[PDB]
Each structure stands twice: as structure tokens, then as C-alpha cells.
């Protein structure tokens, strides 16, 4: 459950991501695929090689969904119902994999926005990504 401070930390940090959201999404993927190879079984049809165009494009889609979640942080289950259907009903992703991706996203953000990634903001982003993960892995339809 996000506090008031949490929600303004996330929106301001995500602001600072700017036009690099897609870059950061793709790097988080790559990091997750290299650090946690089991996660690759969810994309058997992806070219996963280093610098894969398919990974860069997917990264942009994840960034864009996260951006939408930031915009709708107070009504995530309505805003994310399409994605919840995809990940919870169809793919049936194990929630451990969301923790892995969320971790790799925090690593990516820490590496690129060191000034933003204070301890308070780290905490807020962790809770944000855990909230997103809960929506996407819950069948509430």
C-alpha cells in the first residue's frame, strides 16, 4: 500500500527517467535474463541474444505499461486489467519472476539515476513495483 510520500517519490523518479524508459526497460530485461536464466522460458519465441531487437521492443512495452501504472497509481487494478488478464490468466506467471524483474529494474535505475535513487526513493519504488506485480499476478476478473 503506497503512502502519500511513496506516490510522489515514484512520480518524480519516473519523471526523471524521461525518454530513456524504453532503454531502461530493455536493460532490466537483459539483466533479468542473464542473472536468472529460468525466466527465459517465458519467452521461447524471443530472440534473446545480446542487443536483440525483440528485447528492445518488449522493453519499451514494459516501460510504457509501468508509465501507465505511475499515471494511475491510485486505480491500478482498473488501469492494468488488460495486463492482469495476460499475465495471470493466460501466461500464469509465477510471482517470484516479478520479484526478479522488479529487482533488475531497481538495479537499472540505481545504475543510471544515482542522484534519484536515495534510500527513501528506493523504498518507494520497491513498493510501487511490488504493487504492480500484485495486480498483474492476481486474477480479479
Amino acid at each position: 500500500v503506497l503512502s502519500p510520500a511513496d506516490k510522489t517519490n515514484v512520480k518524480a523518479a519516473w519523471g526523471k527517467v524521461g525518454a530513456h524508459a524504453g532503454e531502461y526497460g530493455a536493460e532490466a530485461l537483459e539483466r533479468m535474463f542473464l542473472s536468472f536464466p529460468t525466466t527465459k522460458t517465458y519467452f521461447p519465441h524471443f530472440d534473446l541474444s545480446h542487443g536483440s531487437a525483440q528485447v528492445k521492443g518488449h522493453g519499451k512495452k514494459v516501460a510504457d505499461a509501468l508509465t501507465n501504472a505511475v499515471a494511475h497509481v491510485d486505480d491500478m487494478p482498473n488501469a492494468l486489467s488488460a495486463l492482469s488478464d495476460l499475465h495471470a490468466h493466460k501466461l500464469r506467471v509465477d510471482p517470484v519472476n516479478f520479484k526478479l524483474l522488479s529487482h533488475c529494474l531497481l538495479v537499472t535505475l540505481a545504475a543510471h539515476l544515482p542522484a534519484e535513487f536515495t534510500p527513501a526513493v528506493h523504498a518507494s519504488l520497491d513498493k510501487f513495483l511490488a504493487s504492480v506485480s500484485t495486480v498483474l499476478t492476481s486474477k480479479y476478473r
Binding site: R31, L34, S35, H103, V107, T108, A110, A111, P119, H122
Partner: protein, 145 residues
């Protein structure tokens, strides 16, 4: 465990870590991001705000002991269950720290490493470090096995 290239990239990087800061930043971040871990440090003092935690000298002092413990596992990458057997008994038999928290701290340390080294903390480097912290988490949980 670590491929030759993996082993060499991790030890190059570890050489540059600031041993007087990184330890304290990872524990402080553990106590900030996962606040229930504060319950294990009632003697450490003020933990009421993020800035309070990261300023705590007992937090910083304590964080250096973990950093050195991690540096031990690196020097004994093949024999970790034993390197931490004492640590394991302390945390498991005496403190009863739920071992999920071991995984949490290792992933915070990885964040801290990314925070300090920027682009130098490449995905291949992180992948090697994730092997390390998992091994430390697993060796530290050995008494639970």
C-alpha cells in the same frame, strides 16, 4: 560456480568497493526498504527516518562486518557452507532470522553495487554477483537444511 571470466570480473570490481561506506549503505537500505528488519536492531538506536538510519553509527559500523563477511565468501567461493557455519548458527539457531531476509540483503547489496559503479555494473557482472549473493544466502541458511 563462476566461469574464469566471471571470477575475474567480480574480483576486479570488488577491489574498488569502498569498505567504509558500502557495508553501511546496504544495511541501512535493508532497514529502510524492509522496515520489519528494524525489529532485530532495537539496541542500535534511532531508526525512525531514512536519514536517521543511514546516519546511525551502529548501522555503519555493523555494515562493515557484513561487507567483510561477503569478502570472505569471495575468497572461499567453493566452500561457503563452512565459511558461514558459525554465522549460520548465530542467525539461524540463535536469532531466528527468516532466511528470505538473507536474500533481501544480498539483493540490496547488488543495488548498492549498481548505485556506486554506474554503467560499470554491467548485466554480465551483475549475473556473476547474483550467483555470489545466492551462495552466501544459501550458505547462511545451511543450518535450516
Amino acid at each position: 560456480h563462476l566461469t574464469p571470466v566471471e571470477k575475474s570480473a567480480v574480483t576486479a570490481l570488488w577491489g574498488k568497493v569502498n569498505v567504509d561506506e558500502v557495508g553501511g549503505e546496504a544495511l541501512g537500505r535493508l532497514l529502510v526498504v524492509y522496515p520489519w528488519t528494524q525489529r532485530f536492531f532495537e539496541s542500535f538506536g534511532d531508526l525512525s527516518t531514512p536519514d536517521a538510519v543511514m546516519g546511525n553509527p551502529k548501522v555503519k559500523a555493523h555494515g562493515k562486518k557484513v561487507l567483510g563477511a561477503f569478502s570472505d565468501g569471495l575468497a572461499h567461493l567453493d566452500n561457503l557452507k563452512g565459511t558461514f557455519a558459525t554465522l549460520s548458527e548465530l542467525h539461524c539457531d540463535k536469532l531466528h532470522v527468516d532466511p528470505e531476509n538473507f536474500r533481501l540483503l544480498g539483493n540490496v547489496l547488488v543495488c548498492v553495487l549498481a548505485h556506486h559503479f554506474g554503467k560499470e555494473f554491467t548485466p554480465p557482472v551483475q549475473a556473476a554477483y547474483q550467483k555470489v549473493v545466492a551462495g552466501v544466502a544459501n550458505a547462511l541458511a545451511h543450518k535450516y537444511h
